[PDB]
Amino acid sequence: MNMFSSLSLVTLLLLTMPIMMMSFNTYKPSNYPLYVKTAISYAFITSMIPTMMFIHSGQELIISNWHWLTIQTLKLSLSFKMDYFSMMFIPVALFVTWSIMEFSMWYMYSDPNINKFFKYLLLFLITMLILVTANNLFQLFIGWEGVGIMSFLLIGWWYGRADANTAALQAILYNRIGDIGFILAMAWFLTNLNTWDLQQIFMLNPSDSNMPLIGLALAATGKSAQFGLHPWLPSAMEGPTPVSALLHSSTMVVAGIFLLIRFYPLTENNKYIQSITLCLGAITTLFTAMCALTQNDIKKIIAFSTSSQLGLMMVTIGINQPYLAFLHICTHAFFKAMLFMCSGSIIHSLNDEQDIRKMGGLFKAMPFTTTALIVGSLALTGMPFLTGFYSKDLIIEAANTSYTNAWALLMTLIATSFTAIYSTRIIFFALLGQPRFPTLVNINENNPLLINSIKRLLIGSLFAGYIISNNIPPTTIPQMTMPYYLKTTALIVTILGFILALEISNMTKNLKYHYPSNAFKFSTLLGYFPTIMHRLAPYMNLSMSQK
Amino acid sequence: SDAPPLTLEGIKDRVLYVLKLYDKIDPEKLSVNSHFMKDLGLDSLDQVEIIMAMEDEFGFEIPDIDAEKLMCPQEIVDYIADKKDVYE
Amino acid sequence: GAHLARRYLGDASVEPDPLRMPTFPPDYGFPERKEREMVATQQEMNDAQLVLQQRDYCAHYLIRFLKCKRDSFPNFLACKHERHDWDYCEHLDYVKRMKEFERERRLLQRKKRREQREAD
Amino acid sequence: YLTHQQKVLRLYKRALRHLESWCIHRDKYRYFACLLRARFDEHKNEKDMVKATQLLREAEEEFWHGQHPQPYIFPESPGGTSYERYECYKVPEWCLDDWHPSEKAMYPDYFAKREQWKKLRRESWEREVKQLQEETPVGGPRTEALPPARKQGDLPPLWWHIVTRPRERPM
Amino acid sequence: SKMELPDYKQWKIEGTPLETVQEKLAARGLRDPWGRNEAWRYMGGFANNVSFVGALLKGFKWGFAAFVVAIGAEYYLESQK
Amino acid sequence: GGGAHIEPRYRQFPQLTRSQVIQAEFFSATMWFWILWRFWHDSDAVLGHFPYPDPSQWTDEELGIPPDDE
Amino acid sequence: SFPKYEASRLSSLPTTLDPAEYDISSETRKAQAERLAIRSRLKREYQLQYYDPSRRGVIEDPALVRWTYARSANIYPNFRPNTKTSLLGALFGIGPLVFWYYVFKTDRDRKEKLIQEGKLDRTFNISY
Amino acid sequence: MLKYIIPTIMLMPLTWLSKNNMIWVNSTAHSLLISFTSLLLMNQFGDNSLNFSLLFFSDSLSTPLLILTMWLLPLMLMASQHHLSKENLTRKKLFITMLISLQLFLIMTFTAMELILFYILFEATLVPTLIIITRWGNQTERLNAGLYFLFYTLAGSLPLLVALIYIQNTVGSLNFLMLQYWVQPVHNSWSNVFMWLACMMAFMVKMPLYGLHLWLPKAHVEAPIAGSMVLAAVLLKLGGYGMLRITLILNPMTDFMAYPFIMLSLWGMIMTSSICLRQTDLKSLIAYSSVSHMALVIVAILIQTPWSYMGATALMIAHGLTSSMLFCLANSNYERIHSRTMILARGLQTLLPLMATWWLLASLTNLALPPTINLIGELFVVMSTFSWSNITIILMGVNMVITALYSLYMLIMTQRGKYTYHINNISPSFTRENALMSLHILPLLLLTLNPKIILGPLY
Amino acid sequence: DKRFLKLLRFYILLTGIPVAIGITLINVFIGEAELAEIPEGYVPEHWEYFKHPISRWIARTFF
Numbered sequence A: 001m002n003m004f005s006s007l008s009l010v011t012l013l014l015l016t017m018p019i020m021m022m023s024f025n026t027y028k029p030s031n032y033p034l035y036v037k038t039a040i041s042y043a044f045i046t047s048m049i050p051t052m053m054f055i056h057s058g059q060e061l062i063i064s065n066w067h068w069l070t071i072q073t074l075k076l077s078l079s080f081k082m083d084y085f086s087m088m089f090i091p092v093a094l095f096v097t098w099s100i101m102e103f104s105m106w107y108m109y110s111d112p113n114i115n116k117f118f119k120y121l122l123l124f125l126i127t128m129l130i131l132v133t134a135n136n137l138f139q140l141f142i143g144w145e146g147v148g149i150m151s152f153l154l155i156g157w158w159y160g161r162a163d164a165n166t167a168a169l170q171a172i173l174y175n176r177i178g179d180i181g182f183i184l185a186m187a188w189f190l191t192n193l194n195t196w197d198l199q200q201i202f203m204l205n206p207s208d209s210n211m212p213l214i215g216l217a218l219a220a221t222g223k224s225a226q227f228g229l230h231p232w233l234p235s236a237m238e239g240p241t242p243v244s245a246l247l248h249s250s251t252m253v254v255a256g257i258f259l260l261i262r263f264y265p266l267t268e269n270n271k272y273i274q275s276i277t278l279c280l281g282a283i284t285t286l287f288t289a290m291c292a293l294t295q296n297d298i299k300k301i302i303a304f305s306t307s308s309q310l311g312l313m314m315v316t317i318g319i320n321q322p323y324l325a326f327l328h329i330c331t332h333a334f335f336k337a338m339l340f341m342c343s344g345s346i347i348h349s350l351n352d353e354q355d356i357r358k359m360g361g362l363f364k365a366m367p368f369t370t371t372a373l374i375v376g377s378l379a380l381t382g383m384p385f386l387t388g389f390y391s392k393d394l395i396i397e398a399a400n401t402s403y404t405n406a407w408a409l410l411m412t413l414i415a416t417s418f419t420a421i422y423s424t425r426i427i428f429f430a431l432l433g434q435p436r437f438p439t440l441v442n443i444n445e446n447n448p449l450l451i452n453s454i455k456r457l458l459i460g461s462l463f464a465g466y467i468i469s470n471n472i473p474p475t476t477i478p479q480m481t482m483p484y485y486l487k488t489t490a491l492i493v494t495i496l497g498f499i500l501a502l503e504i505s506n507m508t509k510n511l512k513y514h515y516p517s518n519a520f521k522f523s524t525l526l527g528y529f530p531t532i533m534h535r536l537a538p539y540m541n542l543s544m545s546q547k
Numbered sequence B: 001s002d003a004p005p006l007t008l009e010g011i012k013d014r015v016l017y018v019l020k021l022y023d024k025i026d027p028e029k030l031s032v033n034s035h036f037m038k039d040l041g042l043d044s045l046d047q048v049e050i051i052m053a054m055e056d057e058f059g060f061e062i063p064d065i066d067a068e069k070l071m072c073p074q075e076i077v078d079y080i081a082d083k084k085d086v087y088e
Numbered sequence C: 001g002a003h004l005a006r007r008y009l010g011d012a013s014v015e016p017d018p019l020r021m022p023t024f025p026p027d028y029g030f031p032e033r034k035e036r037e038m039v040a041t042q043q044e045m046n047d048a049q050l051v052l053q054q055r056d057y058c059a060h061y062l063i064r065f066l067k068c069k070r071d072s073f074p075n076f077l078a079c080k081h082e083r084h085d086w087d088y089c090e091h092l093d094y095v096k097r098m099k100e101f102e103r104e105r106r107l108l109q110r111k112k113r114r115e116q117r118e119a120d
Numbered sequence D: 001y002l003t004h005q006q007k008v009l010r011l012y013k014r015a016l017r018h019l020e021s022w023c024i025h026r027d028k029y030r031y032f033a034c035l036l037r038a039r040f041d042e043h044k045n046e047k048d049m050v051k052a053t054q055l056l057r058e059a060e061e062e063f064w065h066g067q068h069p070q071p072y073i074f075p076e077s078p079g080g081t082s083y084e085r086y087e088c089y090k091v092p093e094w095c096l097d098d099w100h101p102s103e104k105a106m107y108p109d110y111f112a113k114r115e116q117w118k119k120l121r122r123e124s125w126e127r128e129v130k131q132l133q134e135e136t137p138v139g140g141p142r143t144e145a146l147p148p149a150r151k152q153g154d155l156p157p158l159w160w161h162i163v164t165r166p167r168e169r170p171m
Numbered sequence E: 001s002k003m004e005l006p007d008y009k010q011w012k013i014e015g016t017p018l019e020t021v022q023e024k025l026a027a028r029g030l031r032d033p034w035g036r037n038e039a040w041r042y043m044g045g046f047a048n049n050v051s052f053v054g055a056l057l058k059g060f061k062w063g064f065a066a067f068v069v070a071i072g073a074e075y076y077l078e079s080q081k
Numbered sequence F: 001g002g003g004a005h006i007e008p009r010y011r012q013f014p015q016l017t018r019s020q021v022i023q024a025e026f027f028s029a030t031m032w033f034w035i036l037w038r039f040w041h042d043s044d045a046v047l048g049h050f051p052y053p054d055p056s057q058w059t060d061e062e063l064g065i066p067p068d069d070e
Numbered sequence G: 001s002f003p004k005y006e007a008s009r010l011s012s013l014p015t016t017l018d019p020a021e022y023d024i025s026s027e028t029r030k031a032q033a034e035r036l037a038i039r040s041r042l043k044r045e046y047q048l049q050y051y052d053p054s055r056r057g058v059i060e061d062p063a064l065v066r067w068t069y070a071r072s073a074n075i076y077p078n079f080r081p082n083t084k085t086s087l088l089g090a091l092f093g094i095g096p097l098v099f100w101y102y103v104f105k106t107d108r109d110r111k112e113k114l115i116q117e118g119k120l121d122r123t124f125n126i127s128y
Numbered sequence H: 001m002l003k004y005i006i007p008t009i010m011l012m013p014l015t016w017l018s019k020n021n022m023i024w025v026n027s028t029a030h031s032l033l034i035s036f037t038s039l040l041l042m043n044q045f046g047d048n049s050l051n052f053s054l055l056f057f058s059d060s061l062s063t064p065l066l067i068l069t070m071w072l073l074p075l076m077l078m079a080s081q082h083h084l085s086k087e088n089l090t091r092k093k094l095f096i097t098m099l100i101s102l103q104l105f106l107i108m109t110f111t112a113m114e115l116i117l118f119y120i121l122f123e124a125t126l127v128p129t130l131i132i133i134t135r136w137g138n139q140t141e142r143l144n145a146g147l148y149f150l151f152y153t154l155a156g157s158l159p160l161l162v163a164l165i166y167i168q169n170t171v172g173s174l175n176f177l178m179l180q181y182w183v184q185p186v187h188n189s190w191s192n193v194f195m196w197l198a199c200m201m202a203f204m205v206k207m208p209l210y211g212l213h214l215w216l217p218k219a220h221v222e223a224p225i226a227g228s229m230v231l232a233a234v235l236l237k238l239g240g241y242g243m244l245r246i247t248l249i250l251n252p253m254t255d256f257m258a259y260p261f262i263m264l265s266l267w268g269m270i271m272t273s274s275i276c277l278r279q280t281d282l283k284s285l286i287a288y289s290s291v292s293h294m295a296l297v298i299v300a301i302l303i304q305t306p307w308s309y310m311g312a313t314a315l316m317i318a319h320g321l322t323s324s325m326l327f328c329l330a331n332s333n334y335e336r337i338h339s340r341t342m343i344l345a346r347g348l349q350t351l352l353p354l355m356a357t358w359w360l361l362a363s364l365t366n367l368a369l370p371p372t373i374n375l376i377g378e379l380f381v382v383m384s385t386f387s388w389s390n391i392t393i394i395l396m397g398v399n400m401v402i403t404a405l406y407s408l409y410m411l412i413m414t415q416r417g418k419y420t421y422h423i424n425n426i427s428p429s430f431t432r433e434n435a436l437m438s439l440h441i442l443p444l445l446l447l448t449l450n451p452k453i454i455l456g457p458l459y
Numbered sequence I: 001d002k003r004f005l006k007l008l009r010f011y012i013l014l015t016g017i018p019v020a021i022g023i024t025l026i027n028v029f030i031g032e033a034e035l036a037e038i039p040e041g042y043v044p045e046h047w048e049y050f051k052h053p054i055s056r057w058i059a060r061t062f063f
C-alpha cells in the first residue's frame, strides 16, 4: 500500500527533477543529454515496481494529495488516478521513450540547441503522464493542453522552415478545435452534474449523457487526427524525425481515444456516440489507407500508416471494447515508433533524402536497418503471435461477431488488407531492388548508441506484446466462439494484402509507359481534403475579417 | 551524420569524372578549362544533359539561368564550390 | 451473413427479431425445463470484484481462474488449465445462445405453415 | 520575355523529372528518357519559327495531365526536405559589433583581420561610388548587372554582405 | 581523404539490362548518350539481391534449423517426465 | 569518430563490418523462431480455438421443438 | 481531353499556358524593360544604404509606410448616403446580431417556463 | 486607507526635492516599497468587508485591483526612463508627478465608500491620462477624436451624475454599505429604463464595449508605453468595478436590459479576434485583443452569477498583467526599430534569445494556457454561460480558437522567422528590458499557486 | 543574456534561501499548535485562533 502508492508518485516528480536543474545552476554542462535519459532509465525501474504490485493486487488507487481550490461546493486538487491504465500505459511509454531517448542523443548531434531539445522532450513526457493519471477533467484538461503546446515547439523546432510554422499552427488550430468539446463536457458535468471528479461522474450514471459524450467525440476528432480534423497529423513530418517518433506516433496521438476509454461506464449505454465514433473511424480508417495506398513520402507515409491504425482504434471503441482497444495503443506504438527510428536510419545513410523512390538496395548495404523493418511491418500487418496481431485478430472478433452497422464492417476489412499493401510498397523500395540513392555513398550505421536504441525497441514488439497479454487480469468475456471464417477472416485477408500489393508492385517493373488516373491522384493527393480545406477556410476566416 | 566533408581537390574529378563517362566526348582531348561549345565541339542541348548529371551526382538542383553559362569545368567547379562555400 | 441475408432478402416474419428475442412464451410446448443453478450466490459475486458483463452463469467457473493467478505471482504460466474450464464452460454457453435462438426461429417458421392452411 | 527558344529548355529538363519519378527504375528511366529525347529529336531539326512557336503550345497543354501526383523535389532546393531547415541557426555577420569584450577576448586573432576587411569596406567605398557613374545610363540603370574593379587593390562595388554571408552549415 | 577514384571504363552495359535499352534502341534508331553512367546501380557489388520472398525469409535457415531442435526438445524433456 | 573507421566509397557497396552483419541474422532468424516455436503449442490460435458447429446439423428434439402438427 | 483548368481566385494559371507570354513583341518588350530598369534603380538606390557601413538603423521604406498608411482609413473616403454599400455593408455588422437576439432569448423564455413547471432537469445542478 | 495615500503623496517631494541623478531611483525604491505594505490589505473576512472610515474601505473584490495598481507604478517607471533620458530635467518630474497622482486617484477610487466620491475620482482619473497620452504622444496626425470623449460625457458621465443624484434623494444615501440594506426592487417603467441606461452606459464605454471601442485602438496608437500600461491594466478595469457594485440596485430590470449588451460582446469577441489577424501593428493588434478579453467580462457581470463574478475578477487581473506585459514586450522592439509595424522586423529569435523566451512565455498565458489564472477565470465564465444558455459555448469556443490563432501568429510572425537583412541595430537585450518582463510573468503564474486571493468576494 | 540570469538567480536567493530555512527551523522546534477546548472564562486574543506560527504571528503584528 504505502510502498505501492509512495513509489508510484516518484516517477512524475522524479522525471521533473532534471527540468528543475535546467532553470537553475550551471554546475555541469555537456552532460545533461545523458542526464535525462538515465532518469527515464531509472524512472522505468520505478515504473516497473508498480507493475508488479498492481498485477498481483489490482490496487487501483486514487490519491488526492492536495486541497488546491474550493468553490461553494467544488474542490480541485493535484490528484492522480493510480489505476490499470496508468500502471500499464506508463511502462510502455517510458519503454518507447527510453528507446527514443538514446535515439535522439545521436541523430540531433547537428543541433547546438540539443540541450534545449531535451528541455522540451522531457517536458512533454511529464504532461502526458499527468494526463493519463489525472483524476479530474481540469487536471486532465491541463495535460490536454500541455501535449498541445509541447507539440507546438517540438513540431516547429526549426522555426525557419515555413512548413514548420504553417504545419505547427495547422495542428494547433485543429488541436484547439477539439478542446471545444472538452470545455463543453466540463460545463455539462458542472451544470447537470456538479463536479469534475470521476468518482461522482461514474457513480451518478447519467441517464441522458448525449451532450457530454458528443464533446468527447469531438475531442478525439482533432487531437487523435480522426477524419474531419485529420490533416495535421501527417503535417508533423516537416520537422525532426525523433520528435515525430514519440509525440505523433506513440504518446500524443493516443489522447483522443484515451478519454473515451477513461469514461467507459458512461459510453456503454448511449449508442448514438458509438455509431458515429464507429463510423468516424470507419471513414478515417480507410480514408487514411485509401489515401496511403499511393503516397510517396517516407515520413508522411508512416504518418498515414499510423493514421489508419489510429482510425481503427475508434472502431474498436465503437464496438464497445473498453480494455481490448487499450491494448492496440501499446502494441502499435512499439514498432511504428521503431519504424520512425528505422526511417531515421534510412535518412541518416541517405544524407537528407526522403523520397520513397530514392531508396533501394538496402538488404545488405543496410543489414541492421533491414533487420527490424520487417518485424514491425509483419507485426503491423498482423503476423501471428506478434505485437500487432493480438489486437488485430482480437479486435475484429466482436466487430464481425456482434451487433454492428452493415457499412461499418464494409471498410473494416477493405482497408485492413491495405494496411499491408503500403508496407510491401515500402519494404520494396526500402529494401528490395538495387540501390537508387545518389552517386556518393554515405552509408554507415556502425554506431553503438543507435544499436542500443534499436536493440531496446527491436525486442519489445517481438516479445513484450506477448508478455503484456499474460499478466493483465480478466475484465471481459472473450468471444472465443465464432464461425471459423470470421475467426480467421483476418487470417484469410491478411495474406491477400501482401500478395495483392505484390501483384501491383512487380508488374510496374516492366518497361511500359504510365497512364494517369483520377483515383490514382484522389488517393495520392490526400482526397483533396487538405489541398482544399487548407486554402479556402483560411481565406474565408481571413479574407472576410476586414469587413 | 558524423561529417560529410567536401574538398576542392576531391571534387575536381567529381565534376570531370562525370564527363569521363560521356559518349559524345573524347576523354583525352578534354581539359579542365576547355570550353564545351568550341573546345569540345558540343551544343547547348548537349550541355543540358551534362548539367543534369551533376544534380544526380551531388544532389542539389541548379537554376535554369545559371546552368547555361557553366560552359567551363572550372565554372562548374566554381558553382559547386561557391554554392556550398567550399574553398580548400 | 446467411442469417442476415435470409431474414430480409427472404421472408422477414420467419426470423425472430434479434433485439426483441426472445418473443414467444417459454412454455410454448416446452415442458419440464430444469432450472439453471448458480454456484456463486450474490455474496460471492459481490466480493469477487467482477464486471457485471463478466458475471453470468459460467462466471462461477471464472472465479477459479484468478484464485490461482493471484498466488501465481510472479510467474503467469501456472493457471493455464483452469482457464479452459471457464472458457469451455463459456464455450457451451455460446452454443446455448445459438440453441436458444433456434427455438424462437423454429416456432415462427413452423407457425407460418399452420396459418397458411388456416386461410388457404 | 526570355524568348521561346530558351522556353524550350524549361520544359525539356522539367518534364524529365516528373518522368524520372514515374520511371523509378534505372533501366526504365534511361529507356523512357530515350523515348522522350527521341520525341524531342522529331522536331529538334524543325527550324520554322511559326511552327516552333506553334510546336510548344500542345507540349504545355500535353504535360499538364501527365504531371506527377507527387513530383520529386531535391532536398536543399525550395520545397525540399532541407528547405531552409538551418536558416534558424545561420547568424548575421554584422552582429559581430555588439559582441561583449570578454566574449571577444576568446578570438583576438580573427577580429584583428576583420578590421582590415572592414577597412577596405570603408576606404574603397568612395571610389566605388564613382566606379558606377561611368557605367550608369541615364533614365535609371538598364540592368542590375555589376562590373569588376578595373584596377588593383579595390573590389567590385556592392559586395560586402555576399562575401561575408554566413556559411551553409552553422553547426 | 585521397578517395582513390577507380577506372572510368569499369562502368559498362555488357551483361546488364542497360544495353537491353541499346538492343531495343536499334529498332528505335538511337543510343543512350550515358550508357556507362548508371552501370553502378547494377555493378560494384549490387548484382544479387533477395526479392520479396527472400526478405521475409531473411535468416530463417538458422531459425528453421534450430526450430526443429527446440520443438523436439519438448519431447526430449517431456518423455522422461 | 575514431579516425574515420569507415571510408565512404563512390558508386560502390558500403565498406561495412562483419560485427554489424552478425546480430542482424540473430533476430532476423529469431524473428520466425517465436512465430513457429509457439505455433506448435499455440496451434489453436492460428487455427481456431474450438470448432464452430454448423447450424444446419441440429434437430427439433435436441431443441425440443414441437413439429407442425404438434 | 486535357480540359483546361478553370482559372479561379484560389488557383493561379500555369505560366506556360497563358497566351499572352508566348509572343513577346514591342507591346511586351517595352513594358518588360521599363520595369527592370525601374526595379534596378530601386535596387541601386537601396544598394547604397545596404552596403554603406555608415548606416546604423532601419531603412524607412516608402512602400511600407503607404501600405500601412492606407490600412488606417477612417473618414477620408466614402460618402454617408451611398446606398450601394452603406445599407448592405451595415447589415454585415448589425444583421446577425438580432439573429442571436431570438436564439438565446427563445431558449431562456422556453427554459423559464419549464422550470416554472418542472419540465427541465436540474436535480443535481448547483453551479449557476 | 490613509497609510497608503500619504506615502503615495510623499513621492511628490521625493520626485522633486531629490538630486538630479537620483530622481528615477528614489521613487523606484519607495514605490516598490509601498506595494509591499499594499499586501496588508488581504486581511479579508468571511462575512464582512473591511470598513475603515466613511471615506475609504476595501472588500475582497477591491484589494486585488488595488495591489495591481500599486504594483504597477514602479514597472511603469522602469520602461519610461529610456525614452525620457533625452528629456530635460524639469519635465521628467512633471510626467512622474502625474503618475503619482494617477495612482493616488486610482487607489482612492477602488477604496471609495461613497458612490459619488467614486464618481468624482472616476472623472479625475481621466485627467492625468489625457496629459500623458497627449503631452508625450507618439504621433502628430491630429485624428480629431475628441467627439468620442465628448460622446463619453454626453452618453456616459453626465447622465450618470443625474442618476446618482436621483438615487440619493429617493433612497436617501449613496453609501454602498447603506445600499446593501436599503436596496429597493426597481420595478419596470420608462423612467427606470432611462435610469438604468444612466448607471451603465458610463462604464460600458470605458471597458470598452464593441461598437463603442473606436477610441481604444487610436488611444494606444498614440499613448506612450508609460501611458498605455495603466490604460489597459487599470483604467479599463474601472467600469467593471462600478458595474459590479452599481448593479446591486438595478434588479430585476437588468433581467432583460442586458440582452443588447450581451449580444454586443458574444458576437463582439469573434469580430475583434478576426481583425487582429489582419492588423498591421503590434500595439493595435493588442488593442483589439484587449477588447476581446474585456468583452467576456461584460457578459459575466450582467448575468450576475456567483461563478461569473469569480471568473470576472481574474480576467481583469490576468489581462491587466497580460496586456501590460505585451505592450512592454512589444515596446522592447520599439526601442530598436522605432516602429509599430509588425512586419518591418522578423525572426528576432535569431538575435534576441531571452527576448523570445518572454514572447513565448507571455503568449502562452495570453491564450489562457492551463492552469494559469488567464484560464481559471476565462474557464470559470464559460461554464456560467451554460446555465444561462447552452448555445453560448459556440461563440466562446470560436473566440478561444481565434484568440489562440492570432496570439501565436504575432509570436510566429516576429520571432519564428528570418532576420531582416538590412536592419543593423539589434543590440543585445538590456538588463532593464528583461527585468521589466520578468516582474510581469512571474507573479502572474504565482497567483496560480494560490487562487484564493483573486477569486472575488463570492469566494 | 546570460548575465541577466545571474541577477535573477542570486537576488531571489539573496533572501529566498533563508525563507525556507527560517520556516524549517521554526517547524522543527516550534512546529504547530494543537486544537484545544475552551476553558470557561478564557477569551483568547484575535491571533489565538490559528495554528501555524507565521499565520499566528502575522495576525498579532499586522491584521
Ligand SMILES: C[C@H](CCC(=O)O)[C@H]1CC[C@H]2[C@@H]3[C@H](O)C[C@@H]4C[C@H](O)CC[C@]4(C)[C@H]3C[C@H](O)[C@]12C
Pocket (backbone or CB within 6 Å): A027, A028, A031, A032, A034, A035, A036, A038
Ligand atoms: C552533487 C553533484 C556534483 C558533483 C561534482 O562535484 O561534480 C551534482 C552536480 C552534477 C550532477 C550530475 C550530472 O548532472 C550528470 C551525472 C552523470 C549522469 O548524467 C547521471 C546524473 C549525474 C550523476 C548527476 C548527479 C548529481 O546531480 C550531480 C553529480
Ligand SMILES: *C(=O)CCCCCCCCCCCCC
Pocket (backbone or CB within 6 Å): A483, C001, C002, C004, F055
Ligand atoms: C455474412 O456476414 C457472411 C457472408 C457469407 C454467408 C454464408 C452463406 C453460405 C453459407 C451458409 C450456410 C453455412 C452457415 C455459415
